[PDB]
């Protein structure tokens, strides 16, 4: 049998996998999945227990829960190298062999090379990271009592003002009330401020939207600091450029919602890449291989209509993998492959638990309507992967 | 018209103030509660929140509810100095003048000098200290899932096997098995280190006691160190002596239980101290005062039975209270006052939620019997001071 071996248990690898477990047969080929983690989070729900309004372990599964032994072998281990002439891949503690080779090992935070954001500033990007950002703000919130001068403490800056980085405050917005009856910390000391670079919050979205999120979060009490580059960043805080001089801000907390690039692994074995992600060829298939596959936000998809690029998400991720485990099938058999084609429904930020704002089918949504929407939306993808188990689950 | 002020709203502050309010009448003295906060905590109790084991709100009581706003005015502040001679108490936010003053500000750590010990370690005194300690902790293995060979966030020295420090081990043990499946860690890889630099854990206590705790604790993964000074504290950890040579333990959280001193307040207003204590007259006043009175941790008292010092305790504590309310009632109404007698009786030593240690009525308890008497001796205080009331609201 032919062995197929998918990298990253993400959006686009689950759906890959699931979908070739779908399609394929008890023999047909041998189909290894490959994670950081024996579990699979749901990368879009992320926000929530990093400013701890939702527990982690409802932005997770099993990995074996999900898939059947007999047709995935899955494989706990971390990719470290891939060797596309020798069509094998290096882990930390073993090597695999692909005649097929599927990659989604997700995005990285991109820093611009900006100083001390490696180092002194968190990434929402996992269960690891989401649980040390929220311990990691309520120990500084404990701190306050006894030291009430240090209003750092109580200072939160976000870096970015994009959907991440707008769900994320919206989140902290609504933890605050209960956050400071624990610790017993006055309301009006406590500031969260996003910090954006571009003229405008949300840039490039509806200016509907976009000043309707400013004012729900504005009057929760949110900062908004626009058109404020973040030059640097230190264990302080970090330092911005307002009207052409530096101004630092003190912050016990800074989050970078900034930006995000392609897994490093990918550029570093020796692809050609834009902003670390692979511009595939219709069948979402690397330039050059015919064996490799690259989905989620390592692949790069260019719109036809505009030459601008589709936006790395969980939606088109999801489409990538469906497209590439039929294709793998049709390609062991000796079949056809089907040209991929993106299908955008639009998409809905969430401001807090119960507001939402989005663009669905070129109709505009609010309030609690649009906030029942991504439940809704989300509790889809629970059900394509898990059933109706996994939603009753959780 | 005379004044009388009260520094300090502990166990001998809040009984000294509350029992004042009984037995005085109405108008017959002006009386002030001074404390840093507005609400009175169960320092007794205060090793459960620092683990963990049970939440903050149940360590603590607002102090305006337990008084009479009519009898009792209480002032939140911040004792800076107290003036003998001008007899004037001096705030952050203010100045007190008194006629009697009663002192009950309690212990402050003792490093004993250790260097990083006061800058790196923690104190288990407080509600806001113990908000931090456990806070700090749940940081700590949040960290190590990112970072798997960092052991040493997993890593908790306990300074001094005293009795802070058996009960503190003891609801940190209680704790691991949830916080190890909150934060994906294996149970084996947690250490908790106990560091004791006298020979035995618990010195100075019954050894039938101290063997049965040691084998409790030691079960659950408790680690004891014995003989074992602590040179230095450093935010990598401490450094100890073993064999009379240095050894490293790398720990991410120190906890110093090790010693207290009275409240370093009392020293630095010129009074005389051992250990930052005063050893008051047998009407806990202070020597060469009529008017000021000691209560609580700041208060030394020997035993005459025995020329040895009695322990700084929360049960002498409510004893002083008890004792200078009656005395200051007397002494205004012009009465005669009574010498403080104290009648110290059993103490239990909790081993986690499910199990303790003790002598009561003198006969020695175990398990759940302990436990059970230990907590319905802690409800008796909170009758004493807050009523049916404040024991129903603990439910
Ligand atoms: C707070 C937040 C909210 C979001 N909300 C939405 C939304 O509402 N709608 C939407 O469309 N998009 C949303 N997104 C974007 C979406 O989550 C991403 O586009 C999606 O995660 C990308 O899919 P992926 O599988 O390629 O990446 P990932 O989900 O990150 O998958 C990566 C997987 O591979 C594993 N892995 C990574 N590196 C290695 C390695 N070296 N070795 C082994 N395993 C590895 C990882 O553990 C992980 O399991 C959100 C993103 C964030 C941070
Ligand atoms: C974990 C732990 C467990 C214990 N278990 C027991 C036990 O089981 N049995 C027993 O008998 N004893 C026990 N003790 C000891 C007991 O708690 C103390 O001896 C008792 O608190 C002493 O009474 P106190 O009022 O003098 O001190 P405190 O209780 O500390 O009272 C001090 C009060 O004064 C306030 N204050 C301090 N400084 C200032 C300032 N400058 N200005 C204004 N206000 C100030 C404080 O905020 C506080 O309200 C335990 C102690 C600890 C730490
Ligand atoms: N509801 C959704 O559909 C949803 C939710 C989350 C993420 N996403 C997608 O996931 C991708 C990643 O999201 P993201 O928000 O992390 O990145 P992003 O690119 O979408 O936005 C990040 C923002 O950071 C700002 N920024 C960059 N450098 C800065 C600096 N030095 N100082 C201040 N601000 C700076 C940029 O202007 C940008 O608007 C996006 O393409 C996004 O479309 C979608």
Redesign the interface.
């Given at each position: 049998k032919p062995s197929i071996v998918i990298l990253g248990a993400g959006y686009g690898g689950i759906v890959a996998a699931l979908g070739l477990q779908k399609r394929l047969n008890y023999n047909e080929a041998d189909i290894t999945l490959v994670n950081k983690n024996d579990y699979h989070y749901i990368t879009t729900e992320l926000h929530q227990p990093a400013a701890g309004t939702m527990h982690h372990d409802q932005a997770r599964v099993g990995i074996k829960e999900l898939i059947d032994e007999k047709k995935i072998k899955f494989v706990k281990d971390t990719v470290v190298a891939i060797d596309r002439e020798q069509q094998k891949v290096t882990l930390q503690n073993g090597e695999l062999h692909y005649d097929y080779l599927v990659v989604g090992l997700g995005s990285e935070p991109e820093t611009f090379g900006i100083e001390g954001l490696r180092e002194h500033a968190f990434s929402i990007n996992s269960?690891?990271?989401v649980?040390?950002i929220?311990?990691?703000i309520?120990?500084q919130?404990?701190?306050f009592?006894?030291e009430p001068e240090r209003t750092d403490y109580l200072t939160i800056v976000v870096g970015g003002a994009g959907f991440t980085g707008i769900e994320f405050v919206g989140e902290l917005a609504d933890r605050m009330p209960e956050l400071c009856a624990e610790?017993?910390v006055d309301p009006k000391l406590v500031r969260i401020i996003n910090v954006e670079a571009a003229p405008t919050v949300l840039p490039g979205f509806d200016p509907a939207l976009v000043n309707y999120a400013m004012d729900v979060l504005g009057g929760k009490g949110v900062e908004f600091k626009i058109g404020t580059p973040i030059k640097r960043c230190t264990p302080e805080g970090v330092v911005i450029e307002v009207d052409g001089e530096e101004e630092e801000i003190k912050a016990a907390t800074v989050v970078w919602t900034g930006g995000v690039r392609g897994n490093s692994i990918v550029e570093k074995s020796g692809f050609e890449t834009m902003r670390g992600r692979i511009k595939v060829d219709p069948y979402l298939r690397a330039p050059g291989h015919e064996n490799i596959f690259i989905v989620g936000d390592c692949a790069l998809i260019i719109n036809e209509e505009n030459n601008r690029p589709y936006p790395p998400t969980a939606q088109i991720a999801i489409q990538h993998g469906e497209n590439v485990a039929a294709n793998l099938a049709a390609l062991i058999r000796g079949g056809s492959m089907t040209p991929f084609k993106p299908h955008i429904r639009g998409t809905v930020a969430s401001l807090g638990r119960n507001d939402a704002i989005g663009i669905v089918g070129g109709r505009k949504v609010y309030g609690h309507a649009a906030s029942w929407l991504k439940k809704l939306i989300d509790m889809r993808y629970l059900y394509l992967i898990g059933g109706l188990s996994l939603v009753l689950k959780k």
């Open positions: 269960i690891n990271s649980r040390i929220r311990q990691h309520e120990y919130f404990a701190k009592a006894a610790y017993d």
